[PDB]
Amino acid sequence: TNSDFVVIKALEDGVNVIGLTRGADTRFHHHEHLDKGEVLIAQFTEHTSAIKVRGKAYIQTRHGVIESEG
Amino acid sequence: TNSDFVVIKALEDGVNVIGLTRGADTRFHHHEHLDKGEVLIAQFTEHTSAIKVRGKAYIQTRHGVIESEG
Amino acid sequence: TNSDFVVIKALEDGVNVIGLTRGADTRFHHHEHLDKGEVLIAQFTEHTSAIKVRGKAYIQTRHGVIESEG
Amino acid sequence: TNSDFVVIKALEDGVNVIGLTRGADTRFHHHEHLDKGEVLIAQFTEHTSAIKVRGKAYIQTRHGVIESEG
Amino acid sequence: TNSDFVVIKALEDGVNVIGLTRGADTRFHHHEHLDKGEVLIAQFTEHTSAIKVRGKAYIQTRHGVIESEG
Amino acid sequence: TNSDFVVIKALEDGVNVIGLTRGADTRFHHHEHLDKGEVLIAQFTEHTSAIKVRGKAYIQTRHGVIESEG
Amino acid sequence: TNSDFVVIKALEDGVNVIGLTRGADTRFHHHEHLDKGEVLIAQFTEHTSAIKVRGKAYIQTRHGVIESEG
Amino acid sequence: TNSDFVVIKALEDGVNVIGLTRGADTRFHHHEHLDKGEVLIAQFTEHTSAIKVRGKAYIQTRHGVIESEG
Amino acid sequence: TNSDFVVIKALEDGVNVIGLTRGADTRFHHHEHLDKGEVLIAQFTEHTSAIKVRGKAYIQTRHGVIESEG
Amino acid sequence: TNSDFVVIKALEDGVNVIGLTRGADTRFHHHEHLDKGEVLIAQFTEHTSAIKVRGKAYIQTRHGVIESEG
Amino acid sequence: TNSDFVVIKALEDGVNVIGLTRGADTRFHHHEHLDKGEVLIAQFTEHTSAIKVRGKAYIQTRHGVIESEG
Amino acid sequence: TNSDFVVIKALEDGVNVIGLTRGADTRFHHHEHLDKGEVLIAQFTEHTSAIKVRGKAYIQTRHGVIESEG
Amino acid sequence: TNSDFVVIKALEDGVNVIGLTRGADTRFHHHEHLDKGEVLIAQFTEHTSAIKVRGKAYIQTRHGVIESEG
Amino acid sequence: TNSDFVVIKALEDGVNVIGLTRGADTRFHHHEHLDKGEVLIAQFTEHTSAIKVRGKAYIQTRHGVIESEG
Amino acid sequence: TNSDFVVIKALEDGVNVIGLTRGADTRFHHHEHLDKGEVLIAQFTEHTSAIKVRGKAYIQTRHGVIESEG
Amino acid sequence: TNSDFVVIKALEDGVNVIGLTRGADTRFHHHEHLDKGEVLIAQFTEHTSAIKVRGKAYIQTRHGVIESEG
Amino acid sequence: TNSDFVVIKALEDGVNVIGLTRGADTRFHHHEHLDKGEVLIAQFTEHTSAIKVRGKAYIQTRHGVIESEG
Amino acid sequence: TNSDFVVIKALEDGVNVIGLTRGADTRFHHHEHLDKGEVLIAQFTEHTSAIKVRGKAYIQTRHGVIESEG
Amino acid sequence: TNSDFVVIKALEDGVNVIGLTRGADTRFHHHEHLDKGEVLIAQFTEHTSAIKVRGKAYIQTRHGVIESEG
Amino acid sequence: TNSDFVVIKALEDGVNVIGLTRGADTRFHHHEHLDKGEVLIAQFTEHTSAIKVRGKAYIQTRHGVIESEG
Ligand SMILES: [Co+2]
Ligand SMILES: [Co+2]
Ligand SMILES: [Co+2]
Ligand SMILES: [Co+2]
Ligand SMILES: [Co+2]
Ligand SMILES: [Co+2]
Ligand SMILES: [Co+2]
Ligand SMILES: [Co+2]
Ligand SMILES: [Co+2]
């Protein structure tokens, strides 16, 4: 349910990180803006079950490294 | 149950991700649209048992990497 | 009982994925149709114990990769 | 008691998979027919403690791969 | 929820480490200043769910090493 | 709510007819397979409010005749 | 719910007319066999919602005339 | 339900008209014999849901005229 | 259930009009004899559900005109 | 039961119009005499279910015009 | 029972219009005298079930136009 | 009893319209005077069951147009 | 008693529309003045049973169009 | 009292649409202003029994099309 | 009250559709924006008694077709 | 509230059909995506009062045929 | 809420002043017509929170003078 | 609500000053006539919220001087 | 909290004015559309705390004059 | 606490306006995005005590005009 995290590094100005709500109905719960060079370490919690990343960014997860260009 | 997640990156405009309900009767409970470049990190929960992906996409799971061509 | 999943990619149109009921009695409980190129990430739940795959498909499990040619 | 499974692929027409009942007395529980090319993913449960395979088949388990020639 | 930590080393003067709150609402909860050379070992707790790092820094996590340039 | 029906004739193999559930939440209810040449007469009821047709088919309604090319 | 009927004339031996059950669940509830030349005038009732016709037959409804070639 | 009727004229000796019961179990509940030239005007009721006609006969319904050759 | 009528004109001496009983069991309820040139206008009621006409006669119904030669 | 009527015009002296009773038993209830030229507009009621016309007369009903020659 | 009417125009002096009674027994309930050129619009009601017209008159009903020469 | 009306236009001075009462007894209840060129739209109501028109007038009813030459 | 309306267009200055009361006793209850060109759509209601039009006007009803010259 | 509507199109600037009260006393209840080109679809209700249109306008009703020139 | 709808197609960008409330008071309740090419099918309900259309649009109703130019 | 339906055929990929909520508040309640060639028959219910169509589509209603070009 | 006013002078015929309601919901509450040369002094009150001015007009407020060119 | 006044000087005979009511519903509550040369000092009060001036007049308020030409 | 206002003049067609909600959470509470030349005088109230203006407009506040070019 | 406001105009794309909470703890409470040209008029309230502006913007307060360059 918990105890797993992602590492997101912003490779450009204005990168959006959106957390979707946990439960029967899914809606936006929070978002964060990151500037060029920022690093965020985010954890899965009792109110967040999905994470969307908009903008150019570099992401590290247990399954490896990925790059978003949104 | 929980504590396991998939990583989906959209390689083209209009990628659809559909979540299926947990219980005896199975029916669509939510869908998400992804544009070219966006990344979604999704978790299995008490209201999601299966995940369906339509469109050209790149998927990372604990068992490896796969690509959907739909 | 839970917390393990399979990955199924349909290599041809009309692939059938059938789930069998958990309990003293056994019969069909649901099935899903997959079009060419689609990917399903399915789990094991309290109402499903066995999974049958009909049609040409590519399967990833904890024990490796297999190909069904039904 | 749970959380373990086997993967059986039928290499010929008419492959039989038999489940044996869990409890003080051991007795047949159900049988399944597989045609050439199909795949079954079967889990150990609280109503099934042993699994028997008749016919030419290819089996993947945690301990490796085996081939039945019955 | 717990039992995981990050290691941050400040590679320049004036590095800021910000902790975010665990709960229904997300709010800034605390920040720490690091001078050129200091090392902070920070854990995930019941009152913390995310950590942001502003400034040039070297970060070690379970998923590897990253560098923030901001 | 009742006393209205549609006539569907399958012009090709594998035509799918899907019923959508009546109520606050809209969800799949049942699907039917039609082979080349068969005819189905379906009625609107208190458990079905919408009907979806996939595949090459010929449809007669109170408003006239239509042809689906799916 | 009622008060509407269809006319089915069998143009060949062994024409099958199947009635599906009205309710939350759907399954076969009755079927009738028609010999060559026979005519059935069937209604819609509280236990029947849909009608399926297998075999070569001539059908008259409020929307016109159709021919099944199953 | 009621308030709808059919007109059958026998064009040969030995025409049989069979009525089917209204309810869950469908069952023949009565039959009538018609000789060459006789006319029967029959109505749908709370104990009749379907009507079957064997023999050479001329039938008039709200949807038009049909002829049975049985 | 009611409120519909037939018009019968006797084209020869001794024309018999028979009314069958309404209910689970069907038996003769009444009959009338008509002489040449006479006209009867008959209504469907709570005790009559079917009508037989024996002898040469001219009949008008909502569906059109028919001639009996019984 | 009601809400329908016939129009009878007497084309010769001495025309008889007979009403039959509505109920379990059928019995003559009333008769009327019409002279050459008179017009009677008669309704169907709770105490009448059939109408018989003896003598030369011209009759108009919802189904058209008829002539009694008796 | 109600809600229908006839239109009578008197073509000669002294035209009689007689209304018969509704119930088990039939008797004259009222009558009206019309002079040449007058027009009466008369409705079927809870106390009138049949209408007789004596005298030369022109009558319009839902079934058409008739002329009384009594 | 309601929901039906007539249209009367006076083609000459002094046209009288008389309304008759609804019930067991029938007596004149009201009259109206119309001057040349004037139009009255009158309805059948709970207290009116018949209408007389004296004088030269033009009348429109559901059954057509008539002219009173009084 | 309701659900039926008339359309009145005034073709000259000072056109009068008078409403008559619904009940045992009949009297004027409202006058309406229309100027040259105005259009009124008026409904039959629980307090109005007849409508009287004075002046030059054009009237549309279910039975057709009429001209008032009062 | 409901279930009937009018369609008004304004052919000039400043067109007034007035609704009159439903009941014993009749007074103004509301008005609407329309500009050159606007279309209003208005319904009869529990508080409106008449509608008056002032100004140049094009009106469609169940009885046909009219034009106001106020 | 219910059970009647209009079809509005936007022929240009920025078409406004306004619904007016049902009750003693009349107020603007909701509006909808339509862009060029969009079709809206709108029903009459318990909270809507009038519909106002601003902008160039094509409207279909039971009375025919109209065009707004606002 | 019920007993009416529309027929939508999708002439291009990704056609959106949106349903609006019934009540004092109006908001998006559900939507459906249609592929090129697919046909949806949709009914008006007690949770839906309006329908929007986005994309190139062909629509059949009681008032005729329309084409959306959104 | 009070103690503040605006001065509006009409520079042309037909100037409309509209007052909006104070509360959670916002609907038009009253409007006023001004002819050329006329002057209105209006106050903000417990029931008014906004004022719209349509038409060519000259407005004085505490912040200065403005001109509406509607 | 108080403590603010306007000064009105009449520049011609017959100048009208109209006071509007303070409350949910707005109506005239008082008219004042001024002759050529007279001066009125009027206060905003608990029963007056707006003031309308008709005629040629000179007005002084806190925002300056205005001239009415009505 | 109250007793202050802004003056907005629309310099172009389609200017949007949005009012945000007063309280712990901020959301769109109402909006208004302005056509070219219209003027709105808007007050701060117990349910509005912030105002956004989209579109070309001219704004007067206690701090001076500003022009929005959105 | 209240009764004072700031005026912010966005001079470039992507301007952020952040509100801080009133109470014992200071935390971010809300943010707003402004596009190039938009104007926001924001008040001080019971839930807000400070306002930060990120991005190129033009600000008007009681103390004068300021320009943010960030
Ligand atoms: Co944001
Ligand atoms: Co969607
Ligand atoms: Co299936
Ligand atoms: Co077997
Ligand atoms: Co027999
Ligand atoms: Co006999
Ligand atoms: Co007499
Ligand atoms: Co007005
Ligand atoms: Co809007």
Side-chain angles (χ1 to χ4, degrees):
Chain A
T1 304
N2 297 315
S3 301
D4 222 346
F5 68 90
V6 298
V7 170
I8 313 159
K9 174 184 182 181
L11 293 172
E12 81 181 6
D13 327 71
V15 159
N16 206 357
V17 170
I18 314 154
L20 314 180
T21 318
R22 176 194 292 259
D25 41 350
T26 300
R27 43 137 182 120
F28 285 20
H29 179 238
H30 209 266
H31 60 289
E32 284 273 324
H33 305 267
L34 297 193
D35 278 289
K36 186 173 164 34
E38 295 285 327
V39 166
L40 168 82
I41 294 103
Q43 201 182 9
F44 279 112
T45 176
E46 223 76 355
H47 299 256
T48 283
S49 56
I51 288 171
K52 197 192 296 186
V53 167
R54 300 208 181 111
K56 182 162 166 102
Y58 184 97
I59 312 173
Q60 284 180 347
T61 53
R62 188 143 51 92
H63 311 327
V65 298
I66 208 159
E67 295 195 36
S68 81
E69 325 189 352
Chain B
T1 295
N2 261 131
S3 298
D4 217 349
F5 68 96
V6 300
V7 168
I8 315 157
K9 178 187 182 182
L11 297 176
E12 87 181 2
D13 277 318
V15 158
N16 217 343
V17 169
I18 310 158
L20 307 182
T21 323
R22 176 186 298 269
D25 45 344
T26 298
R27 36 97 181 171
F28 296 174
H29 94 99
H30 206 248
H31 67 291
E32 277 295 306
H33 304 266
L34 295 197
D35 321 62
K36 182 175 181 177
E38 292 195 357
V39 165
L40 173 83
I41 293 100
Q43 194 180 7
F44 277 112
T45 181
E46 280 305 284
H47 302 257
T48 295
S49 297
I51 288 172
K52 198 176 180 183
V53 175
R54 303 205 200 107
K56 180 149 171 172
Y58 180 97
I59 314 170
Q60 282 180 345
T61 46
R62 189 161 32 120
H63 309 333
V65 295
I66 206 162
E67 284 186 352
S68 85
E69 298 179 356
Chain C
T1 306
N2 291 309
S3 298
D4 221 353
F5 70 96
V6 306
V7 173
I8 314 156
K9 178 188 181 178
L11 301 180
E12 83 179 358
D13 272 318
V15 159
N16 212 348
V17 165
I18 316 159
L20 317 179
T21 318
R22 177 191 298 261
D25 57 344
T26 302
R27 69 188 60 62
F28 287 13
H29 154 236
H30 62 265
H31 61 292
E32 312 288 302
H33 301 265
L34 298 197
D35 289 328
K36 184 179 178 180
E38 296 214 33
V39 173
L40 177 69
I41 292 102
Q43 214 180 13
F44 278 113
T45 177
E46 154 178 313
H47 304 273
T48 283
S49 292
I51 284 173
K52 196 175 176 182
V53 170
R54 295 208 176 115
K56 179 156 166 177
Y58 179 93
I59 313 173
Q60 281 181 346
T61 48
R62 189 143 58 73
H63 309 327
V65 302
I66 203 163
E67 296 183 356
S68 83
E69 309 167 357
Chain D
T1 313
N2 275 128
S3 296
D4 215 356
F5 69 93
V6 301
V7 169
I8 313 156
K9 178 186 182 181
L11 291 179
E12 88 181 5
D13 287 319
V15 160
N16 218 343
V17 167
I18 316 158
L20 308 181
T21 313
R22 175 191 295 262
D25 45 347
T26 295
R27 68 182 183 88
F28 280 14
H29 180 263
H30 180 217
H31 71 290
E32 269 294 303
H33 304 260
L34 289 190
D35 271 88
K36 183 181 180 181
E38 306 198 22
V39 172
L40 169 83
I41 290 99
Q43 197 176 9
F44 277 115
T45 183
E46 82 188 271
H47 282 64
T48 287
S49 297
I51 285 173
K52 199 190 301 180
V53 174
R54 305 209 196 110
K56 179 151 172 174
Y58 181 97
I59 310 171
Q60 281 180 346
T61 51
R62 182 154 47 117
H63 308 331
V65 298
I66 209 159
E67 274 173 348
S68 84
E69 292 180 352
Chain E
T1 307
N2 274 307
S3 300
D4 214 355
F5 66 94
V6 305
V7 165
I8 310 160
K9 178 188 184 182
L11 292 181
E12 85 177 358
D13 283 325
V15 162
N16 215 345
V17 167
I18 309 161
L20 318 187
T21 320
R22 180 189 297 263
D25 60 345
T26 299
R27 62 187 211 88
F28 287 8
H29 177 224
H30 195 74
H31 70 289
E32 282 295 311
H33 301 261
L34 298 197
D35 213 32
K36 183 198 204 309
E38 272 172 52
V39 168
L40 173 82
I41 295 103
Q43 214 183 18
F44 277 109
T45 180
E46 176 185 306
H47 285 71
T48 294
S49 290
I51 286 173
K52 194 199 290 182
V53 175
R54 300 207 188 111
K56 182 152 168 173
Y58 183 102
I59 316 172
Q60 280 176 345
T61 52
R62 177 152 48 110
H63 306 330
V65 302
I66 210 163
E67 269 177 319
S68 79
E69 175 57 34
Chain F
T1 313
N2 275 309
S3 296
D4 215 356
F5 69 93
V6 301
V7 170
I8 313 156
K9 178 186 182 181
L11 291 179
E12 88 181 5
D13 287 319
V15 160
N16 218 343
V17 167
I18 316 158
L20 308 181
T21 313
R22 175 191 295 262
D25 45 347
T26 295
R27 68 182 183 89
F28 281 14
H29 181 83
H30 180 216
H31 70 291
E32 269 294 304
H33 304 260
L34 289 190
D35 271 88
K36 183 181 180 181
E38 306 198 22
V39 172
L40 169 83
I41 291 99
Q43 197 176 9
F44 277 115
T45 183
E46 82 188 271
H47 282 64
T48 287
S49 297
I51 284 173
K52 199 190 302 180
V53 174
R54 305 209 196 110
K56 179 151 172 174
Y58 182 97
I59 310 171
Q60 281 180 346
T61 51
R62 182 154 47 117
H63 308 331
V65 298
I66 209 159
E67 272 173 354
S68 84
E69 292 180 352
Chain G
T1 306
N2 291 310
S3 298
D4 221 352
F5 70 96
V6 306
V7 173
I8 314 156
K9 178 188 181 178
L11 301 180
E12 83 179 357
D13 272 318
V15 159
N16 212 348
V17 165
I18 316 159
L20 317 179
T21 318
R22 177 191 298 262
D25 52 352
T26 303
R27 67 189 60 62
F28 288 12
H29 152 249
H30 65 264
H31 61 292
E32 313 287 302
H33 300 265
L34 298 197
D35 289 328
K36 184 179 178 180
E38 295 214 33
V39 173
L40 177 69
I41 292 102
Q43 214 180 13
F44 278 113
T45 184
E46 154 182 308
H47 304 272
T48 283
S49 292
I51 284 173
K52 196 175 175 182
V53 170
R54 295 208 176 115
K56 179 156 166 177
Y58 179 93
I59 312 173
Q60 281 181 346
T61 48
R62 189 143 58 73
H63 309 327
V65 302
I66 203 163
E67 296 183 356
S68 83
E69 309 167 357
Chain H
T1 295
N2 261 131
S3 298
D4 217 349
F5 69 96
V6 299
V7 168
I8 315 157
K9 178 187 182 182
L11 297 176
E12 87 181 2
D13 277 319
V15 158
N16 217 343
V17 169
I18 315 158
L20 269 67
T21 322
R22 177 185 298 269
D25 40 346
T26 296
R27 177 65 215 119
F28 302 136
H29 85 155
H30 195 93
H31 67 291
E32 277 295 306
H33 304 266
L34 294 197
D35 321 62
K36 182 175 181 177
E38 292 195 357
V39 165
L40 172 82
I41 293 100
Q43 194 180 7
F44 277 112
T45 181
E46 280 305 283
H47 302 257
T48 296
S49 297
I51 288 172
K52 198 176 180 183
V53 175
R54 303 205 200 107
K56 181 149 171 172
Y58 180 97
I59 315 170
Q60 282 180 345
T61 46
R62 190 161 32 120
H63 309 333
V65 295
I66 206 162
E67 284 186 351
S68 85
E69 298 179 356
Chain I
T1 304
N2 297 315
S3 301
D4 207 358
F5 67 90
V6 298
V7 170
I8 313 159
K9 174 185 182 181
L11 294 172
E12 81 181 6
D13 327 71
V15 159
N16 206 357
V17 170
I18 314 155
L20 314 181
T21 318
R22 176 194 292 259
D25 41 349
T26 300
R27 43 137 182 120
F28 284 23
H29 179 238
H30 206 263
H31 60 289
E32 284 273 324
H33 305 267
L34 298 194
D35 279 289
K36 189 173 148 64
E38 196 164 3
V39 168
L40 168 82
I41 293 103
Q43 201 182 9
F44 279 112
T45 176
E46 223 76 355
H47 299 255
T48 283
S49 56
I51 288 171
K52 288 162 63 72
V53 167
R54 300 208 181 111
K56 182 162 167 101
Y58 184 97
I59 312 173
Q60 284 180 347
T61 53
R62 188 143 51 92
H63 311 327
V65 298
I66 208 159
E67 295 194 36
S68 81
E69 325 189 352
Chain J
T1 307
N2 274 307
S3 300
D4 214 355
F5 66 94
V6 305
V7 165
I8 310 160
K9 178 188 184 182
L11 292 181
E12 86 177 358
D13 283 325
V15 162
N16 216 344
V17 167
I18 311 159
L20 318 187
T21 321
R22 180 189 297 263
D25 60 345
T26 298
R27 61 178 203 106
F28 289 9
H29 173 225
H30 195 74
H31 70 289
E32 282 295 311
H33 300 261
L34 298 197
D35 213 31
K36 183 198 204 309
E38 271 172 52
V39 168
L40 173 82
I41 295 103
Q43 214 183 18
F44 277 109
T45 180
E46 176 185 306
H47 285 71
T48 294
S49 291
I51 287 175
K52 195 199 291 181
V53 175
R54 299 207 188 111
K56 182 153 167 175
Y58 183 102
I59 316 172
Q60 280 176 345
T61 52
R62 177 152 48 110
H63 306 330
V65 302
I66 210 163
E67 269 178 319
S68 79
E69 175 57 34
Chain K
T1 310
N2 299 315
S3 297
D4 215 353
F5 73 96
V6 300
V7 167
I8 312 157
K9 178 189 178 181
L11 293 175
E12 88 175 5
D13 267 314
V15 157
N16 209 354
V17 168
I18 313 159
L20 318 182
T21 321
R22 177 190 295 270
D25 39 349
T26 301
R27 66 187 189 274
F28 285 7
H29 176 256
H30 193 70
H31 65 289
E32 270 293 309
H33 299 267
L34 293 192
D35 298 334
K36 182 183 176 183
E38 293 187 45
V39 168
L40 175 66
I41 294 99
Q43 206 187 13
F44 279 109
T45 182
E46 225 78 83
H47 306 268
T48 292
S49 294
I51 287 170
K52 198 194 295 186
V53 171
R54 302 206 185 114
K56 180 149 169 174
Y58 182 92
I59 315 174
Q60 279 180 346
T61 49
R62 184 144 59 91
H63 307 329
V65 298
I66 207 164
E67 288 184 357
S68 85
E69 186 42 291
Chain L
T1 315
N2 262 305
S3 301
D4 213 358
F5 68 94
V6 300
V7 167
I8 315 155
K9 178 186 181 181
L11 292 179
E12 85 176 1
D13 273 319
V15 157
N16 213 345
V17 163
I18 316 156
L20 321 191
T21 315
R22 178 189 301 273
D25 54 351
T26 302
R27 72 274 196 192
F28 292 2
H29 153 237
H30 186 70
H31 68 290
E32 268 288 302
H33 299 265
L34 294 197
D35 270 341
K36 185 172 183 176
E38 190 175 0
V39 173
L40 170 83
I41 294 99
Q43 207 181 14
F44 277 117
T45 176
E46 177 203 82
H47 305 261
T48 287
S49 298
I51 285 167
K52 285 180 67 173
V53 170
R54 304 207 187 115
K56 180 154 165 178
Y58 175 92
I59 318 171
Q60 280 180 347
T61 51
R62 180 194 315 162
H63 308 330
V65 301
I66 208 162
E67 286 209 36
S68 78
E69 302 173 355
Chain M
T1 316
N2 272 306
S3 296
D4 218 355
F5 67 95
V6 301
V7 169
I8 312 157
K9 180 188 181 183
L11 294 183
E12 83 178 1
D13 278 321
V15 158
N16 225 354
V17 162
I18 318 154
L20 296 177
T21 320
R22 178 187 293 264
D25 36 2
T26 302
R27 68 171 185 83
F28 298 176
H29 81 89
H30 193 93
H31 310 247
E32 291 280 330
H33 302 269
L34 296 185
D35 286 309
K36 191 187 151 111
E38 272 163 25
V39 169
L40 170 81
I41 294 99
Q43 210 181 15
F44 272 116
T45 172
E46 151 152 278
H47 301 270
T48 292
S49 293
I51 290 167
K52 190 171 162 68
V53 170
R54 297 208 185 110
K56 183 150 169 174
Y58 176 97
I59 314 174
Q60 279 176 345
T61 53
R62 185 154 57 118
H63 311 324
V65 299
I66 208 163
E67 287 273 335
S68 84
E69 298 170 350
Chain N
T1 316
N2 262 304
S3 301
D4 219 353
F5 69 96
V6 301
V7 166
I8 312 147
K9 175 186 184 182
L11 300 180
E12 89 175 2
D13 286 318
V15 160
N16 208 353
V17 164
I18 310 144
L20 314 179
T21 321
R22 174 185 296 264
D25 49 356
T26 298
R27 70 184 190 273
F28 288 22
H29 185 264
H30 62 265
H31 58 294
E32 281 297 307
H33 295 266
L34 300 195
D35 321 56
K36 190 196 155 64
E38 192 142 23
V39 171
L40 171 82
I41 294 99
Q43 204 183 11
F44 280 113
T45 172
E46 224 43 57
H47 309 271
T48 287
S49 291
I51 284 171
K52 190 178 176 180
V53 172
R54 293 208 182 111
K56 179 152 169 176
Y58 177 97
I59 314 175
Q60 283 179 345
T61 42
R62 170 155 59 120
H63 307 328
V65 296
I66 209 166
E67 302 180 1
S68 78
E69 301 171 355
Chain O
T1 296
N2 259 307
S3 297
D4 220 354
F5 68 94
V6 302
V7 173
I8 311 157
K9 177 190 183 184
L11 295 180
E12 85 182 1
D13 278 314
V15 161
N16 219 341
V17 166
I18 316 155
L20 319 186
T21 323
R22 178 194 296 264
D25 43 348
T26 300
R27 68 183 183 271
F28 289 9
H29 166 214
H30 187 73
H31 66 290
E32 287 283 324
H33 301 261
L34 296 193
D35 36 358
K36 181 189 175 184
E38 177 142 3
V39 175
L40 172 82
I41 295 103
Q43 203 182 15
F44 277 105
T45 182
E46 265 43 69
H47 313 270
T48 290
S49 294
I51 286 168
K52 204 174 185 181
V53 173
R54 302 208 182 114
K56 180 151 172 176
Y58 179 100
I59 313 174
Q60 283 182 345
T61 52
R62 184 153 49 116
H63 310 327
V65 299
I66 207 162
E67 289 190 357
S68 78
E69 303 165 355
Chain P
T1 309
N2 273 310
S3 302
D4 220 359
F5 71 95
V6 304
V7 171
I8 313 158
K9 180 186 183 182
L11 298 182
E12 87 177 3
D13 284 321
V15 159
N16 211 354
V17 166
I18 315 157
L20 308 182
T21 318
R22 173 191 295 262
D25 43 356
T26 300
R27 71 186 192 273
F28 287 5
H29 151 96
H30 208 84
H31 60 294
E32 282 268 317
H33 303 264
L34 302 197
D35 326 351
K36 183 186 201 262
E38 192 165 2
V39 171
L40 176 86
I41 294 103
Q43 205 179 12
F44 272 116
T45 179
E46 61 260 89
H47 289 269
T48 297
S49 68
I51 284 170
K52 274 187 287 297
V53 172
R54 295 208 179 111
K56 180 151 172 172
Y58 177 98
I59 315 173
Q60 280 178 351
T61 55
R62 181 155 38 119
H63 310 328
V65 300
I66 204 158
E67 289 200 0
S68 81
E69 310 168 358
Chain Q
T1 316
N2 262 305
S3 301
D4 213 358
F5 68 94
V6 300
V7 167
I8 315 156
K9 178 186 181 181
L11 292 179
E12 85 176 1
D13 273 319
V15 157
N16 213 345
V17 163
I18 316 156
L20 322 192
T21 318
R22 178 189 301 273
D25 54 351
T26 302
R27 50 77 165 248
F28 292 2
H29 149 252
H30 186 70
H31 68 290
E32 268 289 304
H33 300 265
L34 298 200
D35 271 341
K36 186 172 183 176
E38 200 192 296
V39 171
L40 171 83
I41 293 99
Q43 207 181 14
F44 277 117
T45 176
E46 176 204 84
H47 304 261
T48 287
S49 298
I51 285 167
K52 284 181 67 173
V53 170
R54 304 207 187 115
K56 180 154 165 178
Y58 175 92
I59 318 171
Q60 280 180 347
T61 52
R62 180 194 315 162
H63 308 330
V65 301
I66 208 162
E67 288 209 34
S68 78
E69 301 173 355
Chain R
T1 316
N2 271 306
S3 296
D4 218 355
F5 67 95
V6 301
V7 169
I8 312 157
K9 180 188 181 183
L11 294 183
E12 83 178 1
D13 278 321
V15 158
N16 225 354
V17 162
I18 318 154
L20 296 177
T21 320
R22 177 187 292 265
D25 36 2
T26 302
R27 68 171 185 83
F28 298 176
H29 81 89
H30 193 93
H31 310 247
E32 291 281 330
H33 301 269
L34 296 185
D35 286 309
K36 191 187 151 111
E38 275 166 20
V39 169
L40 170 81
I41 294 100
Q43 210 181 15
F44 273 117
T45 182
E46 151 152 287
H47 301 270
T48 292
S49 294
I51 289 166
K52 191 189 290 189
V53 171
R54 296 209 184 111
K56 183 150 169 174
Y58 178 97
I59 314 174
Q60 279 176 344
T61 53
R62 185 147 51 101
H63 311 324
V65 297
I66 208 162
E67 286 252 353
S68 82
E69 298 170 350
Chain S
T1 309
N2 299 315
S3 297
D4 215 353
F5 73 96
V6 300
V7 167
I8 312 157
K9 178 189 178 181
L11 292 175
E12 88 175 5
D13 267 315
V15 157
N16 209 354
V17 168
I18 313 159
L20 318 181
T21 320
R22 177 190 295 270
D25 39 349
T26 301
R27 66 187 189 274
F28 285 8
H29 176 256
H30 196 260
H31 65 289
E32 270 293 309
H33 299 267
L34 293 192
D35 299 334
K36 182 183 176 183
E38 294 183 44
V39 168
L40 175 66
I41 294 99
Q43 207 187 13
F44 279 110
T45 182
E46 226 71 77
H47 305 274
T48 291
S49 294
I51 287 170
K52 198 194 295 186
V53 171
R54 302 206 185 114
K56 180 149 169 174
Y58 182 92
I59 315 174
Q60 279 180 346
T61 49
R62 184 144 59 91
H63 307 329
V65 298
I66 207 164
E67 289 184 357
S68 85
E69 186 42 291
Chain T
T1 307
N2 274 307
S3 300
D4 214 355
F5 66 94
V6 305
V7 165
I8 311 160
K9 178 188 184 182
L11 292 181
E12 86 177 358
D13 283 325
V15 162
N16 216 345
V17 167
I18 309 161
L20 318 187
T21 320
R22 179 189 296 263
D25 56 347
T26 298
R27 67 186 186 91
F28 290 9
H29 172 226
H30 195 74
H31 70 289
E32 282 295 311
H33 300 261
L34 298 197
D35 213 31
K36 183 198 204 309
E38 272 172 52
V39 168
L40 173 82
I41 295 103
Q43 214 183 18
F44 277 109
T45 180
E46 176 185 306
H47 285 71
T48 294
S49 290
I51 287 173
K52 194 199 291 182
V53 175
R54 300 207 188 111
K56 182 152 168 173
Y58 183 102
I59 316 172
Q60 280 176 345
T61 52
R62 177 152 48 110
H63 306 330
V65 302
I66 210 163
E67 253 167 317
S68 79
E69 175 57 34

